[PDB]
Amino acid sequence: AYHQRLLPAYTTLKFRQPGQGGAADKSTRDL
Amino acid sequence: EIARNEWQRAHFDPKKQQVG
Amino acid sequence: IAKFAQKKKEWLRMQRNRFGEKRKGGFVETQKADMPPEHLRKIVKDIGDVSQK
Amino acid sequence: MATDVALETTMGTIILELYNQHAPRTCENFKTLAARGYYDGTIFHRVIKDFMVQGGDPTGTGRGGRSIYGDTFEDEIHPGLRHTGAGILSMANAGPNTNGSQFFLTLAPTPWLDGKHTIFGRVKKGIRVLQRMGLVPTDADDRPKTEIKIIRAYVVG
Amino acid sequence: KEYQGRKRREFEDYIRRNRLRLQNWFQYAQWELEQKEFARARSIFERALDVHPNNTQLWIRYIEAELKNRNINHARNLLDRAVTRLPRVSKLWYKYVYVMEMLGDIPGTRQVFDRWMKWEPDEDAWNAYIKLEKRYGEYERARQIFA
Amino acid sequence: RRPARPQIDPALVKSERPPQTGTVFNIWYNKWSGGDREDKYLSQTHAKGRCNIARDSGYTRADSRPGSYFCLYFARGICPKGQDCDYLHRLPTIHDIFNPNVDCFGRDKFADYRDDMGGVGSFNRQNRTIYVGRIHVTDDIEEIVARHFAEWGQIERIRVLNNRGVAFITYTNEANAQFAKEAMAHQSLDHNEILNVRWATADPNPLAQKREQRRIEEQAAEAIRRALPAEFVAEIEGKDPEARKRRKLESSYGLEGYEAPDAVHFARGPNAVNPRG
Amino acid sequence: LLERWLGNLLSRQFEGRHSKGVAKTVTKQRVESHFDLELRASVMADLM
Amino acid sequence: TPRTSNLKAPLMELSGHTGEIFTAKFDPTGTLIASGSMDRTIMLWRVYGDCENYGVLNGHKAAILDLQWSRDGDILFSASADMHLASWDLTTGQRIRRYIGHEEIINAMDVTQRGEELLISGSDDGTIGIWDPRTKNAVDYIETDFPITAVAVSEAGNEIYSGGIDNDIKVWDIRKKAVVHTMLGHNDTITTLRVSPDGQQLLSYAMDSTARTWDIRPFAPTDRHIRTFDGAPLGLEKNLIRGSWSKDGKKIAVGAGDGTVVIWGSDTGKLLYKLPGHKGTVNCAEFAPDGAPIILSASSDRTMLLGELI
Amino acid sequence: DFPSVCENCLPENPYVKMLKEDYGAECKLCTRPFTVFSWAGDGRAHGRKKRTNICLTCARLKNACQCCIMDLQFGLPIVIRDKALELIAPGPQSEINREYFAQNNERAIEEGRAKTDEKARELLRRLANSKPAALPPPGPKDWLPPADKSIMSLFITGIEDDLPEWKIRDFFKQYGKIKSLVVSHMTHCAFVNYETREGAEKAATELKGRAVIAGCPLRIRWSIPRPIGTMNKEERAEMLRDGRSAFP
Amino acid sequence: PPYPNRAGWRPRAPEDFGDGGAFPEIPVAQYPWGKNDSSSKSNALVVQVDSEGKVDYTAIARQGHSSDRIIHASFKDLIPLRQRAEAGQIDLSRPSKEEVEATAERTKNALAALVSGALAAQKPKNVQVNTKREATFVKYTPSAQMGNNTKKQERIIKIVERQRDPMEPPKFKHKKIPRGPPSPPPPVMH
Amino acid sequence: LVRRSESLL
Amino acid sequence: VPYTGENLARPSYGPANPFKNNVLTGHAEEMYISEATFRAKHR
Ligand SMILES: [Zn+2]
């Protein structure tokens, strides 16, 4: 069990959509 | 040694402990 | 058919008890019914100020 | 004559003498399985205090046996040898003649296995290793909590 | 018993108040040693070893307190634990070889020195091992020690 | 037979508040609060009824049900239900033994005693000793104690520490001891007094200590003799010389000069080498 | 709001107060004190 | 063990029923599994590729005790304790129709894989029912005096093998509505009746924990037995445990009350397998019909195990 | 997720309907909340809902049933077993040390860490070798009834500590109704007060100044009831010798 | 004595067995290590040996720890891997996507269970009742206990969660117990 | 003594 | 394997102990039966 009293808030994570970069990898020579 | 320490605990006398 | 008669009755009773529509969960299910109002009246009058041990 | 086999355990060394003139077939079975490296890397799967140290299973379970006469062979009880003390090497079976590749060091006088298992040796050197083997914590099914792995067992000579 | 309870209460309150000071553990354990409560003193010292695992002074005092009450096997187990936990503190190794030379037991001192030489110590421990083997004759084994 | 006699009429039995020892009645704890603490425990009053076993016994709606506990209020003499009570209204016999979690009235027994040592009791001591005090100090204490501490059960030993007005009654049964403690508390012996029948502590007399230790030892010995086979235990004590000869001849198994260990000989199982069981 | 508040009230009434063990925030009245703590620890760490 | 068949795992679970799984089957192609359970639903699973549940049928008012794929593999057949049968379209997922007329719980049901299509519904009113799968009314019904718990239809399509509580396997003729011969040897109620893939032998497991293989060929001696198999105990539940034949006919598998599936050799008689893994009575043990060494077990711990034989 | 309950605490029915309550109560030894299992006993339609009274960890430490709290090898109470077998009682019984030990050892207690058998045989062998001017013989005046009809008490001397009061009570119950029986084992004295003088006269007639109860020799006389006070050890010894001398 | 035969010679001395081992030829009970009148009753550890043969002292550092715990306890751990005697090719590659995703699935299932527990604890669901009280059936085979050893019939036990009052507050207070001792600390490998 | 590697690799 | 008949047929070698259970009092396993079976046997 745990002892915290957070009410639910921001219950969905935002993900990097196409156009927002992030989860798209290139070679480090290109970088 | 555990038995000997038990025996020494069960027979301790606070008579000669007063002198250093 | 005389020897296989009580076995037939027991099998029919057991299968009707197990697979009947009236016992879908193992037991006969009824609807939550309304109690007489005097039951609640007596409970509330009896417990009172909640001063008795 | 008695021929020697050396158990290199993770407790010490056990040098066993083997009785060729009293129970031969078990003795060259033991010699051939020891010299081939078959008993190199198995476990001492069962230890019962004041009864037994039993091992030799390739699987370490209680069912493995790879005797050189196929998969099993027959019993060779000679009434001159009886289980009579601590440290006697005998070949263990399950009921009638089912001798595989499991050996059985008696840790105490057990005069009730006579005629059921094939006495075919003796601990010659290193009885303290077997005494420390008997005094191991075993959990529920006589298998020790730690491992008493055998490494080498050689004819020496 | 009232005096024992009040002293135990005072010592435990000092331990709860500041557990990172070795003097409280030392005083409580020495006092419980004085009424011959060896299990209690051992428990206090082991709790201090739980608070201070790598303190060499606490290890030395607990081995000494075990030795001065003629508990030899307990103290030898304690020295094994101490040289297991801190193999690079030469003080514990030196005490361990000194104790098992004081009690006779020359092969035991030799195997302790063999463990120490397995840990590859400084030149002082090698010279001490050579002096050990030179004292009781035994020159050829000192030659392998020089090798 | 005979139905259970109603002891007190329901007109005299109510459920009212305790006498006012304060200004505000606390309804969560059901206790008076306020006033002064000089009152506190005040005194132990005189109870509203005693018991006659020959007069108040009978049958209830509990003789039909096996395992029913005895009645606390029939033991207190203030049970009005009579034959309609759900608990037994008779005296505990010698075969009325209970497990070490409940008393004879079904109340749960505790880990340790309370400091004001009364109540249900603790299961960490098989206590059959009841401590009675507050007896009017006369010269005929022993006769009246033996007369009145006798209708509750079967008694082992009553030591009357006279002059102090204190007696220690040890019944042979723990349920009888609990019945006597719940029956004689706040009763009168011959004059108008309130008896302080509480749970006895331990008699420091070393003779009583060795008596209790021995009795514990033959109780455990009785349990072990019930557990073990008769031939096994008969070889175990070996007071019988024929049993000794049977042990010498049987524990050989072919090999002479063995004298088989008790772990091997006195062993029970399907694969043991013995007559087994 | 009031049912959460009364649940918290009954929780303190029937299982006690968890007074010790929670992390207090650094409010304004604590800022300087907190700074001192952190700075001392940092200095102490560098010394070791 | 190395990989033997074309499965994602050597053995794997199928779960999702909230009641006891009473009957599980296979596609004639061998790629689809249909299971009916105590929870009045039918779950349709895909064996190969990703093992995906792809269908649920919900039309029955009580437990579904049987379900049988048609000769092609697009129609499903449900016998259910609501005193009904049902034909289901497995393309739209809807129910085609319901078959009404049985006055008690239907325990068994079989369709003809060769010839005209019929339905064989044995039920506790002592009635076998021969149904056409286009009309909601029964073509015929043969009335007996004892509840019937296992039926099977022959290769010829004119013989009905019926087992019930009278401890006899009765062989009836459809056009005559009469038993052509009775087959004795059991002493507890027959739970399954399966004809061999070649049609030369008959398997019958009963509640005495003995599975009997029988010679079924028309020119046979007076005793039409073959062999008896032990080692599949029936536990506390008096379920209708149903066995199956392997495609080559060499092996037979019967679920046990210990959570095990006991597999024997039909010709030799050795206990080839005793497969654990269930926490209840294994109601069905089936072989893959498409020449694969695959066994599916359905058990009253609400689960099915798909395993390969190595 | 399953209790450790003995067979005699379980119902006689082989099919048990059992309720389970997570953290339903605190253990009666370590005072920690634990899962309580409860069932209805064979005493149908009234009685007590039998339940697991202690937790499973304390049931491993004590080797006891969770309901009855008795030893699961001999059927003895835990303290009786521990006193009569001299066992270690593996765990502290203090307040905070109980939760400390349970918090720090709950994984090794489950595996049987932290078998009496031989100590029971040791106890049986120890109880095998258990080791627990004279006055003239009584003349006729000792058992003849006195002329005073108010004399009612019967004085017994020679009582050992092994003789309970109930053996004397049902040994003298066959002669008549006993109003009172005072047995002081500290002073080896006993007083029997009847309700009718005929019963006391019959006791004196068929006892004749001597008695043997459970192998213990006792001496009986007529006596006016007097109290027993703080009394000298030498006088106790000499009337013990007199009670032994009741059988010369 | 040698072994073409050993009849007529009884072991009378503790050294008659050589180092030890009772002779099967003699049909007399033989005690190679004397009377086991008392038990071992020793609290020492089982002394093991290593591959080359020395007393193994890693049972002291590993005392109180599981077998999967990594404990450095010898000077061999202070040597570089490349220079560490029996060390040829060393594989220094990351795990492939299969093992990486398998570990990701396992760890995220465990952390998802922890998130569910933390969310249950963080905000309770107002009323904590569940009327979907499905029974659990247990096959319980009793052993022998309390004296008697008769084989009792095995039992089928229905275990149902008890109906709890939705209005009941938490029953017991929270106790502040001090921290237990840490895991046994490793050797100090300076 | 714990052996080292003399391969100069 | 190890579920075949010849694997279950082979016994455990060696002698028997002259001197397991899931819980402290016996062996208890989770089982799955119909509600009607338990009700009928209990009845
Ligand atoms: Zn119990």
Coordinates of N, CA and C in Angstrom, one line a residue, chain E:
Chain E
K1 N 17.1 -4.7 39.6 CA 16.4 -4.7 38.3 C 15.9 -3.3 38.0
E2 N 15.5 -2.5 39.0 CA 15.1 -1.1 38.7 C 16.3 -0.3 38.2
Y3 N 17.5 -0.5 38.8 CA 18.7 0.1 38.3 C 19.0 -0.3 36.9
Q4 N 18.9 -1.6 36.6 CA 19.2 -2.2 35.2 C 18.2 -1.6 34.2
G5 N 16.9 -1.5 34.6 CA 15.9 -0.9 33.7 C 16.2 0.6 33.4
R6 N 16.5 1.3 34.5 CA 16.8 2.8 34.3 C 18.0 3.0 33.5
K7 N 19.1 2.2 33.7 CA 20.3 2.3 32.9 C 20.0 1.9 31.4
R8 N 19.3 0.9 31.2 CA 18.9 0.5 29.8 C 18.1 1.5 29.2
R9 N 17.1 2.1 29.9 CA 16.3 3.2 29.3 C 17.2 4.4 29.0
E10 N 18.1 4.8 29.8 CA 19.0 5.9 29.5 C 19.9 5.6 28.3
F11 N 20.4 4.4 28.2 CA 21.3 4.1 27.1 C 20.5 4.0 25.8
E12 N 19.3 3.4 25.8 CA 18.5 3.3 24.6 C 18.0 4.7 24.2
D13 N 17.8 5.6 25.2 CA 17.3 7.0 24.8 C 18.5 7.7 24.2
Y14 N 19.7 7.5 24.7 CA 20.9 8.1 24.0 C 21.1 7.5 22.6
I15 N 20.8 6.2 22.5 CA 21.0 5.6 21.1 C 20.0 6.1 20.2
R16 N 18.7 6.2 20.6 CA 17.7 6.8 19.8 C 17.9 8.3 19.5
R17 N 18.5 9.0 20.4 CA 18.7 10.4 20.2 C 19.8 10.7 19.2
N18 N 20.9 10.0 19.3 CA 22.0 10.2 18.3 C 22.6 8.8 18.2
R19 N 22.2 8.1 17.1 CA 22.8 6.8 16.8 C 24.1 6.8 16.1
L20 N 24.5 7.9 15.6 CA 25.7 8.0 14.8 C 27.0 8.3 15.7
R21 N 26.8 8.2 17.0 CA 27.9 8.4 17.9 C 28.3 7.1 18.5
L22 N 29.5 6.6 18.3 CA 29.9 5.3 18.8 C 30.0 5.1 20.3
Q23 N 30.1 6.2 21.0 CA 30.3 6.2 22.4 C 29.1 5.6 23.1
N24 N 27.9 5.9 22.6 CA 26.7 5.4 23.2 C 26.6 3.9 23.1
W25 N 26.9 3.4 21.9 CA 26.9 1.9 21.7 C 28.0 1.3 22.6
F26 N 29.1 1.9 22.7 CA 30.2 1.4 23.5 C 29.9 1.3 24.9
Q27 N 29.3 2.4 25.5 CA 29.0 2.4 26.9 C 27.8 1.4 27.2
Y28 N 26.8 1.4 26.4 CA 25.7 0.4 26.6 C 26.2 -1.0 26.6
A29 N 27.0 -1.3 25.6 CA 27.5 -2.7 25.5 C 28.5 -3.1 26.6
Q30 N 29.4 -2.2 27.0 CA 30.3 -2.4 28.1 C 29.5 -2.6 29.4
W31 N 28.5 -1.7 29.6 CA 27.7 -1.9 30.9 C 27.0 -3.2 30.9
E32 N 26.4 -3.6 29.8 CA 25.7 -4.9 29.7 C 26.7 -6.0 29.8
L33 N 27.9 -5.8 29.4 CA 29.0 -6.8 29.7 C 29.2 -6.9 31.2
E34 N 29.1 -5.8 31.9 CA 29.5 -5.8 33.3 C 28.5 -6.6 34.2
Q35 N 27.2 -6.7 33.9 CA 26.3 -7.6 34.5 C 26.3 -8.9 33.9
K36 N 27.3 -9.3 33.1 CA 27.4 -10.6 32.5 C 26.3 -11.0 31.6
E37 N 25.6 -10.0 31.0 CA 24.6 -10.2 30.0 C 25.2 -10.2 28.6
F38 N 25.8 -11.4 28.2 CA 26.6 -11.5 27.0 C 25.7 -11.5 25.8
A39 N 24.5 -12.1 25.8 CA 23.6 -12.0 24.7 C 23.1 -10.6 24.4
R40 N 22.9 -9.9 25.5 CA 22.4 -8.5 25.4 C 23.5 -7.6 24.8
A41 N 24.8 -7.8 25.3 CA 25.9 -7.0 24.8 C 26.2 -7.3 23.3
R42 N 26.1 -8.6 23.0 CA 26.2 -9.0 21.6 C 25.2 -8.4 20.7
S43 N 23.9 -8.4 21.2 CA 22.9 -7.7 20.4 C 23.1 -6.2 20.2
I44 N 23.6 -5.6 21.3 CA 23.9 -4.1 21.2 C 25.0 -3.9 20.2
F45 N 26.1 -4.7 20.3 CA 27.2 -4.6 19.3 C 26.8 -4.9 17.9
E46 N 25.9 -5.9 17.7 CA 25.5 -6.2 16.3 C 24.5 -5.1 15.8
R47 N 23.7 -4.5 16.6 CA 23.0 -3.3 16.2 C 23.9 -2.1 15.8
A48 N 24.9 -1.9 16.6 CA 25.9 -0.9 16.3 C 26.6 -1.2 14.9
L49 N 26.9 -2.5 14.7 CA 27.4 -2.9 13.4 C 26.4 -2.8 12.3
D50 N 25.1 -2.8 12.6 CA 24.1 -2.4 11.6 C 24.1 -1.0 11.3
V51 N 24.3 -0.1 12.3 CA 24.5 1.3 12.1 C 25.8 1.7 11.5
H52 N 26.9 1.1 12.0 CA 28.3 1.4 11.5 C 28.9 0.1 11.0
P53 N 28.7 -0.3 9.7 CA 29.2 -1.6 9.2 C 30.7 -1.6 9.1
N54 N 31.3 -0.5 8.6 CA 32.7 -0.5 8.2 C 33.6 0.3 9.2
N55 N 33.1 0.4 10.4 CA 33.9 1.0 11.5 C 34.9 0.0 12.0
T56 N 36.2 0.3 11.9 CA 37.2 -0.7 12.3 C 37.3 -0.7 13.9
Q57 N 37.1 0.5 14.5 CA 37.2 0.6 15.9 C 36.1 -0.2 16.6
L58 N 34.9 -0.2 16.1 CA 33.8 -1.0 16.7 C 34.1 -2.5 16.5
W59 N 34.6 -2.9 15.4 CA 35.0 -4.3 15.2 C 36.1 -4.7 16.2
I60 N 37.1 -3.8 16.4 CA 38.2 -4.2 17.3 C 37.7 -4.3 18.7
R61 N 36.8 -3.3 19.1 CA 36.3 -3.4 20.5 C 35.4 -4.6 20.7
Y62 N 34.6 -5.0 19.7 CA 33.7 -6.1 19.9 C 34.5 -7.4 19.8
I63 N 35.5 -7.6 19.0 CA 36.4 -8.7 19.1 C 37.1 -8.8 20.5
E64 N 37.6 -7.6 20.9 CA 38.2 -7.6 22.2 C 37.3 -8.0 23.4
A65 N 36.1 -7.4 23.3 CA 35.1 -7.7 24.4 C 34.7 -9.2 24.3
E66 N 34.6 -9.8 23.2 CA 34.4 -11.2 23.1 C 35.6 -12.0 23.6
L67 N 36.8 -11.5 23.4 CA 38.0 -12.3 23.8 C 38.2 -12.2 25.3
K68 N 38.0 -11.1 25.9 CA 38.3 -10.9 27.4 C 37.3 -11.7 28.3
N69 N 36.2 -12.2 27.7 CA 35.3 -13.1 28.4 C 35.5 -14.6 28.0
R70 N 36.7 -14.9 27.4 CA 37.1 -16.2 27.0 C 36.1 -16.9 26.1
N71 N 35.4 -16.1 25.2 CA 34.6 -16.7 24.1 C 35.5 -16.7 22.9
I72 N 36.2 -17.8 22.7 CA 37.2 -17.9 21.7 C 36.6 -18.2 20.3
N73 N 35.6 -19.1 20.2 CA 35.0 -19.4 18.9 C 34.1 -18.3 18.4
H74 N 33.4 -17.7 19.3 CA 32.7 -16.5 18.9 C 33.6 -15.4 18.4
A75 N 34.7 -15.1 19.0 CA 35.6 -14.1 18.6 C 36.3 -14.5 17.3
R76 N 36.5 -15.8 17.1 CA 37.2 -16.2 15.8 C 36.2 -16.0 14.7
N77 N 34.9 -16.3 14.9 CA 33.9 -16.1 13.9 C 33.8 -14.6 13.6
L78 N 33.9 -13.8 14.7 CA 33.9 -12.3 14.6 C 35.0 -11.8 13.8
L79 N 36.2 -12.3 14.0 CA 37.4 -11.9 13.2 C 37.3 -12.4 11.7
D80 N 36.7 -13.5 11.5 CA 36.4 -13.9 10.1 C 35.4 -12.9 9.4
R81 N 34.4 -12.5 10.1 CA 33.5 -11.5 9.6 C 34.2 -10.2 9.4
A82 N 35.1 -9.8 10.3 CA 35.8 -8.5 10.2 C 36.7 -8.5 9.0
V83 N 37.5 -9.6 8.8 CA 38.4 -9.6 7.7 C 37.7 -9.9 6.4
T84 N 36.4 -10.4 6.4 CA 35.6 -10.5 5.2 C 35.1 -9.1 4.8
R85 N 34.6 -8.3 5.8 CA 34.0 -7.1 5.5 C 35.0 -6.0 5.1
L86 N 36.2 -6.0 5.8 CA 37.2 -5.0 5.5 C 38.6 -5.7 5.3
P87 N 38.7 -6.3 4.1 CA 40.0 -7.0 3.8 C 41.2 -6.1 3.6
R88 N 41.0 -4.8 3.5 CA 42.1 -3.9 3.2 C 42.5 -3.1 4.4
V89 N 41.9 -3.4 5.6 CA 42.4 -2.8 6.9 C 43.3 -3.8 7.5
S90 N 44.6 -3.5 7.5 CA 45.7 -4.3 8.0 C 45.6 -4.5 9.5
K91 N 44.9 -3.6 10.2 CA 44.8 -3.7 11.7 C 44.0 -4.9 12.1
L92 N 42.9 -5.2 11.4 CA 42.1 -6.4 11.7 C 42.9 -7.7 11.4
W93 N 43.6 -7.7 10.3 CA 44.4 -8.9 9.9 C 45.5 -9.1 11.0
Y94 N 46.2 -8.0 11.4 CA 47.3 -8.1 12.3 C 46.7 -8.6 13.7
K95 N 45.6 -8.1 14.1 CA 45.0 -8.6 15.3 C 44.6 -10.0 15.2
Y96 N 44.1 -10.5 14.0 CA 43.7 -11.8 13.8 C 44.8 -12.8 13.9
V97 N 46.0 -12.5 13.2 CA 47.1 -13.4 13.3 C 47.7 -13.3 14.7
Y98 N 47.7 -12.2 15.4 CA 48.2 -12.1 16.8 C 47.4 -12.9 17.7
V99 N 46.1 -12.9 17.6 CA 45.2 -13.7 18.5 C 45.4 -15.2 18.2
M100 N 45.4 -15.6 17.0 CA 45.6 -17.0 16.7 C 47.1 -17.4 16.8
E101 N 48.0 -16.5 17.1 CA 49.3 -17.0 17.5 C 49.5 -17.0 19.1
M102 N 48.8 -16.1 19.8 CA 48.7 -16.2 21.2 C 48.1 -17.5 21.8
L103 N 47.1 -18.0 21.0 CA 46.4 -19.2 21.5 C 47.0 -20.5 21.0
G104 N 48.4 -20.6 20.8 CA 49.0 -21.7 20.1 C 48.6 -21.6 18.6
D105 N 48.2 -22.7 18.1 CA 47.4 -22.8 16.8 C 48.3 -22.1 15.6
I106 N 49.4 -22.8 15.4 CA 50.3 -22.2 14.3 C 49.8 -22.5 12.9
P107 N 49.3 -23.7 12.6 CA 48.6 -23.9 11.3 C 47.5 -23.0 11.0
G108 N 46.7 -22.6 12.1 CA 45.6 -21.7 11.9 C 46.1 -20.3 11.6
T109 N 47.2 -19.9 12.2 CA 47.8 -18.6 11.9 C 48.4 -18.6 10.5
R110 N 48.9 -19.8 10.1 CA 49.4 -19.9 8.7 C 48.3 -19.8 7.7
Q111 N 47.2 -20.4 7.9 CA 46.1 -20.3 6.9 C 45.5 -18.9 6.9
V112 N 45.4 -18.2 8.1 CA 45.0 -16.8 8.1 C 46.0 -15.9 7.3
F113 N 47.3 -16.2 7.5 CA 48.3 -15.5 6.6 C 48.2 -15.9 5.2
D114 N 47.8 -17.1 4.9 CA 47.6 -17.5 3.5 C 46.4 -16.7 2.8
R115 N 45.3 -16.5 3.6 CA 44.2 -15.7 3.1 C 44.7 -14.2 2.9
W116 N 45.5 -13.7 3.9 CA 46.0 -12.4 3.8 C 46.9 -12.2 2.5
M117 N 47.7 -13.2 2.3 CA 48.6 -13.2 1.1 C 47.8 -13.4 -0.2
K118 N 46.7 -14.1 -0.1 CA 45.7 -14.1 -1.3 C 45.2 -12.7 -1.6
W119 N 45.0 -11.9 -0.6 CA 44.6 -10.5 -0.8 C 45.7 -9.6 -1.2
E120 N 46.9 -10.1 -1.4 CA 48.1 -9.3 -1.9 C 48.3 -8.0 -1.1
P121 N 48.8 -8.1 0.2 CA 48.9 -6.9 1.0 C 50.2 -6.2 0.7
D122 N 50.5 -5.2 1.6 CA 51.8 -4.5 1.5 C 52.9 -5.4 2.0
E123 N 54.1 -4.8 1.9 CA 55.3 -5.6 2.2 C 55.4 -6.0 3.7
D124 N 54.8 -5.2 4.6 CA 54.8 -5.5 6.0 C 54.2 -6.8 6.4
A125 N 53.1 -7.2 5.8 CA 52.5 -8.4 6.0 C 53.3 -9.6 5.5
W126 N 53.9 -9.4 4.4 CA 54.8 -10.5 3.9 C 56.0 -10.7 4.8
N127 N 56.6 -9.6 5.3 CA 57.7 -9.7 6.3 C 57.2 -10.3 7.6
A128 N 56.0 -10.0 8.0 CA 55.4 -10.6 9.2 C 55.2 -12.1 9.0
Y129 N 54.7 -12.6 7.9 CA 54.6 -14.0 7.6 C 55.9 -14.7 7.5
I130 N 56.9 -14.1 6.9 CA 58.3 -14.6 6.9 C 58.9 -14.7 8.3
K131 N 58.6 -13.7 9.1 CA 59.1 -13.8 10.5 C 58.4 -14.9 11.3
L132 N 57.1 -15.1 11.1 CA 56.3 -16.2 11.7 C 56.9 -17.5 11.3
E133 N 57.2 -17.7 10.0 CA 57.8 -19.0 9.6 C 59.2 -19.2 10.0
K134 N 60.0 -18.1 10.2 CA 61.3 -18.2 10.6 C 61.4 -18.4 12.1
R135 N 60.4 -18.0 12.9 CA 60.5 -18.2 14.3 C 60.4 -19.6 14.7
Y136 N 59.5 -20.4 14.1 CA 59.3 -21.8 14.3 C 60.1 -22.7 13.3
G137 N 61.3 -22.4 13.1 CA 62.1 -23.2 12.2 C 61.7 -22.9 10.7
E138 N 61.2 -23.9 10.0 CA 60.4 -23.8 8.8 C 60.9 -22.7 7.8
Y139 N 62.1 -23.0 7.3 CA 62.7 -22.1 6.4 C 62.3 -22.3 4.9
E140 N 62.1 -23.5 4.5 CA 61.7 -23.8 3.1 C 60.4 -23.2 2.8
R141 N 59.4 -23.3 3.7 CA 58.1 -22.7 3.5 C 58.2 -21.2 3.4
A142 N 59.2 -20.6 4.2 CA 59.5 -19.2 4.0 C 60.1 -18.9 2.6
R143 N 60.8 -19.9 2.1 CA 61.3 -19.7 0.7 C 60.2 -19.7 -0.3
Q144 N 59.1 -20.5 -0.2 CA 58.0 -20.3 -1.1 C 57.3 -19.0 -0.8
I145 N 57.3 -18.5 0.5 CA 56.7 -17.2 0.8 C 57.5 -16.1 0.1
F146 N 58.9 -16.2 0.1 CA 59.7 -15.2 -0.7 C 59.4 -15.4 -2.2
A147 N 59.1 -16.6 -2.7 CA 58.7 -16.7 -4.1 C 57.4 -15.9 -4.5

